[PDB]
Amino acid sequence: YSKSMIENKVFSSCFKSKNERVDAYSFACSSYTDKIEEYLYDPANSFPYKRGVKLVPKENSIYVEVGADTDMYGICVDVCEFSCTAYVLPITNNFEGYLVTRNPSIKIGEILDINNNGVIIKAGGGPPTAINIYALSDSFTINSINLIKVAIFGNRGLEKT
Amino acid sequence: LFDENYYAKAVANIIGEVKDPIMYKWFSPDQIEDVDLQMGYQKTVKWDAFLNANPTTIANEVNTISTIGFSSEVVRLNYLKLQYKFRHLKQTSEKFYTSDSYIGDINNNLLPFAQAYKLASSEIIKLINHFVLTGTVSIQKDGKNQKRLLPNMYGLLNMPEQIKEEVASGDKDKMDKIFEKIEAGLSKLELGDEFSTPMMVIVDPATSLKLVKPYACEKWEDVLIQTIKAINNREDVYIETSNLLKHKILIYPLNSELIKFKPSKYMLPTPNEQVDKDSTDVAHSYIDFVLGGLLATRKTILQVNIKQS
Amino acid sequence: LFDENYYAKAVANIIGEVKDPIMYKWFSPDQIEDVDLQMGYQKTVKWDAFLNANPTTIANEVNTISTIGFSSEVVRLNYLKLQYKFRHLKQTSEKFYTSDSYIGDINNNLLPFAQAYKLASSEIIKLINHFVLTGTVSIQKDGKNQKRLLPNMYGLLNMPEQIKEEVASGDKDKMDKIFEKIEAGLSKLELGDEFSTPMMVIVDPATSLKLVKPYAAASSCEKWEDVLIQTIKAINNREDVYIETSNLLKHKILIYPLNSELIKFKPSKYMLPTPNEQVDKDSTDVAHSYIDFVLGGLLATRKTILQVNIKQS
Amino acid sequence: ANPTTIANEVNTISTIGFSSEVVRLNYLKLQYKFRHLKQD
Amino acid sequence: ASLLDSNFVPINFTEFVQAISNTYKQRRIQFYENLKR
């Protein structure tokens, strides 16, 4: 898929709850001194936008591919499809923003984990979580893709259950 | 300054395209008085006088004359400073994104500084209006994840020591019960000698729909207006509909001696001097605003809440 | 501005000491035309006409006349913006690192901004020349770890739909076999109606050294270079033929006409290195600067480039 | 490293390094002694 | 509007960049004028 996604016959119809857009600005709270890196991504394997990515050093360049929490390099916050370039916030930096999830029913304050597809899921799935992820809001569906506001702050000392 | 600060130049050139806040319609021109304070608290002192005894008749010789006393009251108001950040294109980079009849990256959702500032200012003004009407700060339709605010920072709906009426969920569709509660609140209202003043009523869209129903060839709105005219010395009575309210009715006078808005003269959005820059074409800018400053006398606002559950 | 930006003043003062790119010798003056773009795509439309029938004889009264049609084709080119960063010394800190013979910190490899910018610009110009000649961007002699580029971004060596010939490994020293392949490629060339134009050939140093041997029993008064020139003149309507040696090439011979109607170079006006306004500063004596450059913009008609590769393995 | 493609927001950019080489030339003094007749 | 002309004084960085581009174009033109194959 894509982020921008088209001519319309008519325009689409308060200030509240207007941020529920797939192409919304990922950082709920931004900050200067946040490190952002550029990498290449596979244009036919998996679309890394708003997903946890890992570094795959290929024979021609270092790419980023959707990955699990065990081998996560960071979070892909934006993509330039013209150059097929992914922008990554390293895991060493804090993040507070909207990410792609696969569970349409997640409550606030729950512990979360990133799966092999770079997707937010409940931490009770069984895999030992290695990152501190907490749900700051209930998951909402855009009609279909599920998004959720999360706070990610570093790695977890001892893997939980 | 305009020879050096392109952003200040653009803000000056486009400041006039931001529409006026709708909160001005809820107050009289004399009720609003700006103050000089960004963040902190300000103490307002109100003086009064009273008669100690009956006046003294001046006849022949007399030295013992009745006296007039004085009293004072101190009120503290809190003001809060808030900020927002937005991204935009750079001035030296706008030329490479000036397309036909528009400027900016449609794919990247990047806009020129002037347009971005205008949109951000409009959104912040909407938020300020919501805070003034309600007294709470939230960005969700459910009204949750509210930002905790300082004490002595109240809106019209949540101001304490006012008349509060509740309509039970079983009577949520009975306009007769709603009007009975409204009459009870109006009876409990205390305006004293300042009763000769125009009155303002704010209602939600559902209540607005219910009001135009026939009275049980007369309308509930007409009956309410007559009832309010009975108490306000038959002055003007204004009715307003706001989507920021839900199952709430607000009634209050427009007299500057009872309810006064003393906002900071920096309350409306103002650009900040700091602009984030790097080697790319994307920059960041900051907008400041100030919240707080509503003062009201006791028992001068009627707030009716119609419970839904 | 020069009263406020010492870096801009120094760049203006020292910009003239950067040598011109060597890629200018591979194109005619008319073949290069600047464009105003940094990143994105640009479309070019070429118009053609054709005859529908025989001409109509005009005699007495005629209302029906033979018509002439038209056709068009669209070509899309891509451009890419790239940047580099380099550290240097703060302007006010140069006096504390001035020496009797030089300025800068040898022990820490710190230079004045002017010299650092000159060296970085020279390196970037070399990289741009390599990209223009070969069509790939890399910093390794092996040629691997290539930076992925945009589509419709090609060089003279990797332009698709051209004539490619391969001299086998066993004949890597047989100049006769090399000339056989060259003649086959020249025969396969299709210049259309623009054949009467000068031609340009670029060769590696090894091939250039082989080209000065007497023509082969060895023949006198004639060289392999002369034989090649005559062969190319046999197809270019006896026009001029130029030969160049480039160390960037390796066992490669590139032949193409110097005609703007067939091959054109429309580079961005900011293709050559340009300083960036942003300068990183802190409480120390070390500052950072940025240089920008734009790549892309080579257009060529199909089947007008001959690329002969001599195989070693 | 390879150059950085400036698109959208990025602050991590490939760098260009510098080096300084010091060239030293050594000069040595040498002598011979030979016998002759005072002023076979 | 070129760095070759010492009488030219840029006002801002955009003018400086334009002058740099014009200087590069003029240098290329001069090289092609002086070139003799």
PDB file of C-alpha atoms in Angstrom, chain C residues 39 80-87 106 109 111 116 120 138-139 145 147 290 293, chain D residues 1-7 10-22:
ATOM      1  CA  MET C  39      14.862  16.772  -7.407  1.00  0.00           C
ATOM      2  CA  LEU C  80      18.528  13.307  -7.646  1.00  0.00           C
ATOM      3  CA  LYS C  81      19.913  15.636  -4.971  1.00  0.00           C
ATOM      4  CA  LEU C  82      22.787  14.448  -2.773  1.00  0.00           C
ATOM      5  CA  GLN C  83      24.696  16.006   0.114  1.00  0.00           C
ATOM      6  CA  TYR C  84      27.961  15.570   1.999  1.00  0.00           C
ATOM      7  CA  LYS C  85      29.154  16.927   5.341  1.00  0.00           C
ATOM      8  CA  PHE C  86      32.653  17.858   6.460  1.00  0.00           C
ATOM      9  CA  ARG C  87      34.239  19.261   9.608  1.00  0.00           C
ATOM     10  CA  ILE C 106      48.003  18.504  11.822  1.00  0.00           C
ATOM     11  CA  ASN C 109      43.435  16.672  10.822  1.00  0.00           C
ATOM     12  CA  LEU C 111      41.825  22.510   8.147  1.00  0.00           C
ATOM     13  CA  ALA C 116      38.458  21.877   3.327  1.00  0.00           C
ATOM     14  CA  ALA C 120      35.663  18.289  -0.776  1.00  0.00           C
ATOM     15  CA  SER C 138      30.256   3.968  -5.762  1.00  0.00           C
ATOM     16  CA  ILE C 139      33.301   4.687  -3.609  1.00  0.00           C
ATOM     17  CA  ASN C 145      28.055  -1.286  -2.614  1.00  0.00           C
ATOM     18  CA  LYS C 147      23.960   3.525  -4.311  1.00  0.00           C
ATOM     19  CA  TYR C 290      27.448  20.789   3.905  1.00  0.00           C
ATOM     20  CA  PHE C 293      25.040  18.374  -5.832  1.00  0.00           C
TER      21      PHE C 293
ATOM     22  CA  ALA D   1      30.430   6.636   2.555  1.00  0.00           C
ATOM     23  CA  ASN D   2      27.901   7.056  -0.228  1.00  0.00           C
ATOM     24  CA  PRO D   3      26.226  10.483  -0.432  1.00  0.00           C
ATOM     25  CA  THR D   4      22.970  11.138   1.400  1.00  0.00           C
ATOM     26  CA  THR D   5      19.775  11.659  -0.607  1.00  0.00           C
ATOM     27  CA  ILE D   6      18.194  14.852   0.749  1.00  0.00           C
ATOM     28  CA  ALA D   7      14.468  14.119   0.929  1.00  0.00           C
ATOM     29  CA  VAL D  10      17.160  13.786   7.951  1.00  0.00           C
ATOM     30  CA  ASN D  11      20.075  14.821  10.154  1.00  0.00           C
ATOM     31  CA  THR D  12      22.373  11.760   9.884  1.00  0.00           C
ATOM     32  CA  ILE D  13      24.534  12.487   6.839  1.00  0.00           C
ATOM     33  CA  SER D  14      27.622  10.819   5.392  1.00  0.00           C
ATOM     34  CA  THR D  15      30.852  12.685   6.074  1.00  0.00           C
ATOM     35  CA  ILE D  16      34.041  13.559   4.201  1.00  0.00           C
ATOM     36  CA  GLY D  17      37.307  12.946   6.022  1.00  0.00           C
ATOM     37  CA  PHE D  18      40.685  14.645   5.830  1.00  0.00           C
ATOM     38  CA  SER D  19      44.241  13.463   6.424  1.00  0.00           C
ATOM     39  CA  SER D  20      47.636  15.141   6.748  1.00  0.00           C
ATOM     40  CA  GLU D  21      50.892  13.524   5.636  1.00  0.00           C
ATOM     41  CA  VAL D  22      54.309  14.803   6.726  1.00  0.00           C
TER      42      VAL D  22
END
